[PDB]
């Protein structure tokens, strides 16, 4: 159904309903079999978190006689899978190739909105308590029914300590587990890494595969910790008046730090591997930092022709952060953990030297009297201790167990779906958009203010092969800061906060502006479900892929990439320039806020129609408008003509249905002047100075009435990017004529991807280990011509008012209605499963002879 | 592990076909004995 149905369907006139319906259909197709993280963990992880998007490529030229690629095959992927920085203990100042001095922090706050709790059924004990509390008494002094008056309102003498503590919740039984599910999906994706395997600002350094070993680092300054106290049930209830702790503990969302939350967990569940992950995912984060254990083994440098260099030149001075380190979550600040059903000599099975209030004491005595406060999850269970090396499978086992338990016992399908959609908004991290600039023809030199070719944010570090002429970024301190400030999430929001750890000083800079918010998880629901006061919802999933954390994470990453592609499409439709997301977006032309005012409408309608959550939690302009600006980084002299576009064009076509096939390239001979316009410029003396032919660019209304016009616009304005020289063939014939510009002639902008990154598309799966061949053996076109995967020119250089502009003939010989005279890059989406994916499918669907599925099928 | 056997060969594949074609020397001989053959027999002793 991926092709045939969806790849044969194009955009429809009401574009938002068409896009939403398509995204719903694609989400239904996102399937990684749950019984695959059983026989092969790494393959399932790769399929779930680093999807592929196959497409076919070709070029056309009119009078060439040169062969040129016609039907190449490639696999397009988006996103940073991890982040490369200088190591913590680098005392030098010499720039390191690929190693950023700091890293961004995408700080997420606490949403003012609460996940709506759905109704729950009580257990037999809860039903008993409800029946007691709703019973008719005489309230005389002979029985205990009078104690509610003679002792206190909060007395246990009728409903036991438990029915009294849970009385308000059994009068109105409800629950909602979306926040914890969102945090779980995020923890999985951020620890493992979504995306294309790219792991640096350098667009050429790639992460070899999913990491196998992680190392935990503590930082007093950067970490966002939670304080914990451990009590036995007997000790916890003995610190309140007449016993009887408070009935409700959920704080106001605006003040999660005001009070101390509590969690009631039976002694049986404490030993479960899911318990430490239960304490995480509901707390603030990150309480500790995760790194790949050794960067030399899992990092490679890819040359412009596909050559893989495994040991990159500065391995020993670099640290490979996981995306876990780049995100910051706000949750509870103080949590009470109360174990129910243990003796006065209870021993904390995790980290030694930790004594539970009312448990075994430091000296060997029972009934420990102090309620010790521990700062951060690492000061308890040693599995999160500083400088601890762990294998990722053991780290994520508890996460998978937690997901399965909560979804199959306490949650519903609606909660899981909503958690997936929310998590998708934070599931991917992209670098600042690189763009090139063609320049303009020498024949129009006096009518332009953008004569020279230029590029922005084009950074590569491979020295084995020849470097593309467009990659001229030098990673200095100011440029590093600007490029970090340009990094964005799927909906386009950048971050103002960042961290930095070199020499031996650990420092973090968090702003008041936040990239988004997540709802708080109500701990009362967890206590009620683990104390078995609510009946389970085991028969309310209805989906499949919901019981499995990995299948849900695949759904989330698919949705997040779809969010990015739709955001790029919206930015094109809203005419949001790429420069409105750089570091200096707030000090350049006022067009930035004006573009935001339309971009926000597009995103807010999409989020209301598809996701259903409060929009402001998933996208807002706070970080965009709170740009800091780096002083010592002047912008490149490029016109603002190309859109946001963090994804390559084939991914955008996958998610939108845009068709850019070879049938849109025109080869007409022209003898009648239809569709042509005369472009005239005259001086103050009345003499003509230009007198050039030109064709009018379509208006957005025209494409709204006929979407094929957009496909034609791509063919008329796209040229293949050359490797060795900055002379694109299109500028020998054509130029843009904009009457709204003081000097009306400009070139073309073309979002850039670089040959190093494009060679990572030559393998169907993102695994790069010096045994993979990325060089196309029988086609040498890529040696000199780069693919053009950019969205076309923007169709409007003014967000509010529409003015016609033209593509004009710069040489007076090429007639614009005859068709392009340069190389034109057509595209097509292709359905194609990789060899590794087919091998896994044979394992679990034809060679799966497990005892179940054979004997327990009834 | 990258090439899928059911996708088809990735190397150079030599197809073949038989062709009917007479040589120039063979055609010249055929003209000699079937159109330029004016021997006395085959003309006068044909009955």
Place of tokens 């006395």: B40
> How many beta carbons lie within 10 A of that of residue A445, not counting itself?
10
Q: Which segments within A745-819 are labelled E, that is strand?
A: 745-746, 785-786, 806-809
- Shortest Cα–Cα distance, B12 to chain A (Å): 10
Q: In this complex, which of A772, A773, A835 lies closest to B4 when CB atoms are compared?
A: A835
Alpha-carbon distance of A833 to A287, in angstroms, equals 39
Q: Do B4 and A763 touch (CB under 8 A)?
A: no
Quote the tokens at residue A98: 């690929």
Calculate the dihedral angle through the C-alpha atoms of A446, A448, A449, A450, rounding to the nearest 10 degrees. Answer: -120
Look up residue A84 and give its two tokens.
Answer: 């490369």
CA distance B24 to chain A (A): 34
Other Cβ atoms closer than 10 A to A466: 14
B4: chain A residues, CB-CB within 8 Å: 835, 838
How many CA atoms does the CB half-sphere of A190 hold within 13 Å?
A: 27
The Cα–Cα gap between A720 and A727 comes to 11
- B contacts of A838 (beta carbons < 8 Å): 4
- Distance (Å) from the alpha carbon of B17 to chain A's nearest alpha carbon: 26
In this structure, what DSSP letter does residue A198 have?
Answer: B
- Among A763, A772, A838, beta carbon nearest to B4: A838
Tell the residue number behind the tokens 């596909």, with chain if given: A306
Name the minimum distance, in Å, from the CA of A843 to any CA of chain B.
Answer: 15
Other CB atoms within a 10 A radius of the CB of residue A634 amount to 9
**Which tokens in the block code for residue A225?**
């910790």
β-strands A373-375, A505-509 pairing: unpaired
Closest CA in chain A for residue B3:
A835
Q: How far apart are CA A215 and CA A391, in angstroms?
A: 9
Interface of A with B (CB under 8 A): 763-764, 772-773, 835-836, 838
How close, in Å, is residue B19 to chain A by CA atoms? 29
The Cβ of residue A806 has, within 10 Å, a number of other Cβ atoms equal to: 20
B1:A835 CB<8 A: yes
- Residue A723 CA to residue A725 CA, distance in Å, equals 6
Tokens of A259: 């009070």
Residues of chain B with Cβ-Cβ distance to A209 below 8 Å are none
Distance from CA of B4 to the nearest CA of A (A): 6
Is the alpha carbon torsion for A763, A767, A770, A772 positive or negative?
negative
Pick the closest to residue A526 from A236, A283, A255, A231 (CA basis). Answer: A283
Cα distance from A824 to chain B (closest Cα, Å)? Answer: 27
Concatenate the DSSP letters of all residues of A142-164 into one string.
TSGGGHHHHT-SS--TTTHHHHH
Place of tokens 């070029």: A59
Min Cα–Cα distance to chain A from B22, Å: 35
Q: Nearest residue of B to residue A767 by CA position?
A: B2
Residue with tokens 């020279």: A452
A765 to chain B: closest CA residue: B2
Q: Which residues of B touch A774 (CB under 8 A)?
A: none
The DSSP secondary structure of A11-41, one letter per residue, reads --SSHHHHHHHHHHHHHHH----GGGTTT-H
Q: Which of A398, A419, A393 is nearest to A546 (CA)?
A: A419
| Contact check, Cβ <8 Å, A772/B2 | yes
What is the resolution of the experimental data for this entry, in Å? 2.1
Q: How far apart are the two ends of chain B, measured CA to CA in Å?
A: 77
For residue A26, say if its preceding peptide bond is cis, omega within 30 degrees of 0.
no
Nearest-Cα residue of chain A relative to residue B6 = A835
Instruction: Give the Cα separation of A328 and A110 in Å (integer).
Output: 11
Q: Nearest residue on chain B to A774, judged by CA atoms?
A: B2
To test the contact with chain B by mutation, choose from A835, A836, A839, A841 the residue with the greatest count of B C-beta atoms within 10 A, namely: A835
Which position has the token pair 């780069």?
A: A786
Cα–Cα distance, A622 to A592 (Å, whole number):
13
Cα atoms found within 13 Å of the Cα of residue A641, Cβ hemisphere only: 26
Determine, for residues B4 and A772 on separate chains, whether the beta-carbon distance falls below 8 Å: no
- The residue in chain A having the minimum alpha-carbon distance to the alpha carbon of residue B5 is A835
Q: Considering just the CA atoms, what is the radius of gyration of chain B in Å?
A: 26
Where does residue A74 rank: exposed (0-12), middle (13-18), buried (19+ CB within 10 A)?
buried
Distances (CA, A) of A318 to A313, A325, A621: 10, 15, 33
Cβ within 8 Å of residue A79, ≥6 positions away:
A194, A195, A196, A198, A428, A429, A430, A561
Give the DSSP letter of residue A676: -
DSSP string, A69-117: -SSEEEE---SBSSEEEE-TT----S-BTTBBSEEEEEEEEE-SS-PPP
Residues from chain B that touch A760, judged by Cβ atoms under 8 A, are none
Tell me how the structure was determined: cryo-EM
Partners of A835 on chain B (C-beta within 8 Å) are 1-4
Q: Residue A836: closest CA among chain B residues belongs to which residue?
A: B1
Nearest one of A106, A226, A121, A170 to A520, comparing CA atoms: A226
Q: Using the beta-carbon criterion (under 8 Å), do B2 and A764 form an inter-chain contact?
A: yes
What is the residue whose two structure tokens read 């190389």?
A823
Detail the DSSP E strand segments found in A347-445. Answer: 373-375, 388-391, 435-437
| Distance, CA of A231 to CA of A368 (rounded, Å) | 9
User: Residue A566 in 3-state DSSP?
Assistant: helix
CB pairs under 8 A between A and B: 10
Task: Name A506's bridge partners.
Answer: A501
Alpha helices in A734-781 (DSSP H): 755-759
- Sign of the CA dihedral running A750, A755, A757, A759: positive
**DSSP states along A221-266:** TT----EEEEEEHHHHHTTSTTS---S--PPPTT-TTSS-EEEEEE
Q: Is A817 strand, coil or helix?
A: helix
Cross-chain residue pair A836–B1, CB shorter than 8 Å = yes
What's the CA gap between A415 and A175, in Å, rounded?
10
Question: Exposed, middle or buried: residue A510 (CB in 10 Å: 0-12, 13-18, 19+)?
Answer: middle
**Nearest residue to A76 (alpha-carbon basis) of A209, A190, A195, A193:** A195
Rounded Cα gap, residues A442 and A376, in angstroms: 64
Distance CA A761, CA A755 (A): 10
A772 chain-B contacts, CB cut-off 8 A: 2
List of E strands, A327-479: 327-329, 334-340, 373-375, 388-391, 435-437, 454-456
Give which of A74, A305, A52 is closest to A196, Cα–Cα.
A52
Searching chain B, which residue's CA lies closest to the CA of residue A762?
A: B2
User: How close is the nearest chain B Cα to the Cα of A760, in Å?
Assistant: 14
User: What's A660's DSSP letter?
Assistant: -
Buried b (16+ CB within 10 A) or exposed e, A167-184: bebbeebebbbbbbbbbb
Written as one string, the DSSP assignment of A597-614 is HHHHHHHHHHIIIII-S-
Distance separating alpha carbons of residues A531 and A290, to the nearest angstrom:
33
**How close are the terminal C-alpha atoms of chain A, in Å?**
30
Residues ≥6 apart with Cβ < 8 Å to B23: none
Residue A671 tokens, joined: 């003898």
């Amino acid at each position: 159904k991926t092709l045939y149905n969806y790849y044969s369907e194009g955009p429809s006139t009401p574009i938002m309903p068409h896009l939403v319906n398509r995204l719903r259909g694609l989400d239904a197709l996102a399937k990684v079999d749950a019984t695959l993280s059983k026989v092969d963990m790494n393959a399932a992880y790769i399929f779930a978190l680093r999807p592929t998007f196959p497409y076919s490529y070709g070029y056309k030229q009119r009078f060439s006689n040169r062969r040129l690629t016609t039907s190449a095959l490639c696999y397009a992927r988006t996103g940073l899978s991890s982040f490369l920085t200088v190591d913590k203990t680098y005392t030098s100042n010499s720039p390191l190739k690929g190693g950023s001095r700091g890293w961004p922090i995408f700080n997420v706050g606490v949403s003012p909105h609460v996940a709506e709790p759905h109704m729950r059924t009580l257990s037999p004990i809860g039903l008993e308590v409800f029946n007691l509390a709703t019973s008719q008494f005489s309230k005389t002094l002979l029985t205990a029914s009078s104690k509610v008056f003679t002792q206190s309102l909060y007395t246990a003498d009728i409903l036991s300590i438990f029915g009294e503590v849970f009385l308000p919740h059994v009068m109105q039984p409800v629950s909602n587990y979306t926040p914890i599910l969102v945090r779980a999906l995020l923890a999985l994706i951020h620890i493992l890494g979504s995306g294309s395997g790219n792991c640096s600002l350098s667009s050429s350094i790639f992460e070899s595969s999913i990491p196998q070993f992680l190392t935990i680092s503590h930082s007093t300054n950067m970490s966002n910790r939670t304080r914990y106290c451990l009590h036995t049930w007997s000790a916890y209830k003995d610190m309140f008046r007449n016993g009887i702790p408070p009935q409700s503990t959920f704080p106001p969302t605006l003040a999660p730090e005001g009070s101390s939350a509590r969690i009631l967990i039976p002694a049986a569940l404490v030993t479960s591997p899911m318990f430490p992950w239960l304490l995480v995912l509901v707390s603030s984060g990150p309480q500790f930092f995760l790194y790949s254990k050794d960067a030399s083994i899992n990092t490679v440098d890819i040359g412009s022709r596909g050559r893989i260099t495994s040991p990159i030149p500065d391995v020993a001075h670099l640290d490979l952060h996981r995306l876990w380190n780049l995100f910051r979550f706000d949750g509870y600040r103080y949590i009470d953990v109360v174990i129910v059903g243990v003796d006065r000599d209870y021993v904390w099975p995790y980290q030694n030297g930790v004594y539970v209030h009312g448990g075994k004491g430091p000296k060997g005595t029972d009934n420990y009297e102090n309620a010790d406060v521990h700062d951060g999850i690492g000061t308890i269970f040693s599995s999160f201790n500083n400088n601890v090396n762990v294998q990722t499978s053991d780290l994520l086992l508890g996460l998978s167990t937690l997901w399965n338990h909560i979804t199959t016992t306490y949650a519903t399908e609606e909660e899981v779906t909503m958690a997936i959609k929310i998590a998708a908004a934070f599931a991917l991290v992209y670098p600042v958009q690189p763009i090139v600039y063609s320049g303009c023809s020498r024949a129009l030199y006096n009518h332009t203010s953008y004569f020279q070719p230029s590029s922005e944010n084009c950074y590569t570090t491979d020295t084995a092969e020849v470097k593309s002429t467009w990659d001229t970024v030098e990673l200095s301190v100011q440029v590093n800061n600007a490029m970090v400030l340009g990094m964005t999430l799927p909906f386009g929001q950048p971050t103002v906060s960042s961290a930095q750890w070199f020499n031996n000083i650990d420092k973090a800079e968090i702003s008041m502006f936040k990239v988004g918010n997540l709802p708080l998880q109500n701990l009362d629901y967890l206590s009620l479900d683990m104390m078995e006061f609510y009946a389970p919802t085991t028969g309310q999933l209805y989906d499949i892929r919901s019981d499995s954390l990995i299948s849900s994470a695949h759904r989330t990453v698919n949705l997040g990439i779809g969010y990015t592609a739709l955001a790029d499409f919206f930015a094109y439709l809203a005419s949001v320039p790429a420069q409105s997301f750089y570091h200096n977006r707030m000090v350049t032309s006022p067009i930035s806020k004006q573009a935001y005012s339309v971009y926000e409408r597009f995103i807010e309608r999409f989020i209301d129609d598809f996701v259903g959550w409060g929009r402001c939690d998933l996208f807002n302009l706070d970080t965009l408008l709170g740009a800091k600006r780096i002083a010592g980084v002047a912008s490149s002299p490029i016109p603002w003509h190309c859109s946001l576009q963090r994804c390559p064009l084939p991914i955008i076509m996958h998610y939108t249905g845009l068709h850019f096939g070879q049938e849109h390239i025109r080869v007409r001979d022209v003898a009648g002047v239809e569709g042509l316009q005369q472009i005239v410029l005259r001086n103050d003396q009345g003499s003509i100075v230009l007198d050039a032919l030109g064709t009018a660019a379509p208006s957005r209304l025209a494409v709204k009435l006929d979407w094929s016009r957009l496909s034609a616009w791509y063919s008329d304005t796209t040229c293949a990017i050359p490797i060795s020289d900055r002379v694109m063939e299109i500028v020998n014939y054509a130029a843009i004529w904009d009457p709204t510009q003081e000097r009306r002639a400009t070139g073309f902008v073309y979002t850039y991807f670089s040959p190093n990154f494009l060679s990572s598309f030559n393998v169907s799966e993102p695994i790069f280990n010096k045994t993979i061949n990325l060089t196309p053996p029988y086609d040498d076109t890529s040696q000199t011509v780069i693919q053009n995967l950019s969205m076309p020119q923007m169709l409007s250089f003014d967000p509010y008012y529409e003015s016609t502009f033209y593509v004009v003939s710069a040489d007076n010989e090429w007639v614009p209605t005859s068709g392009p005279a340069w190389k034109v890059p057509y595209l097509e989406n292709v359905v194609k499963r990789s060899g590794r994916r087919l091998l896994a499918e044979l394992r679990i669907a034809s060679n799966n002879g497990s005892g179940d599925r054979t004997f327990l099928d009834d």
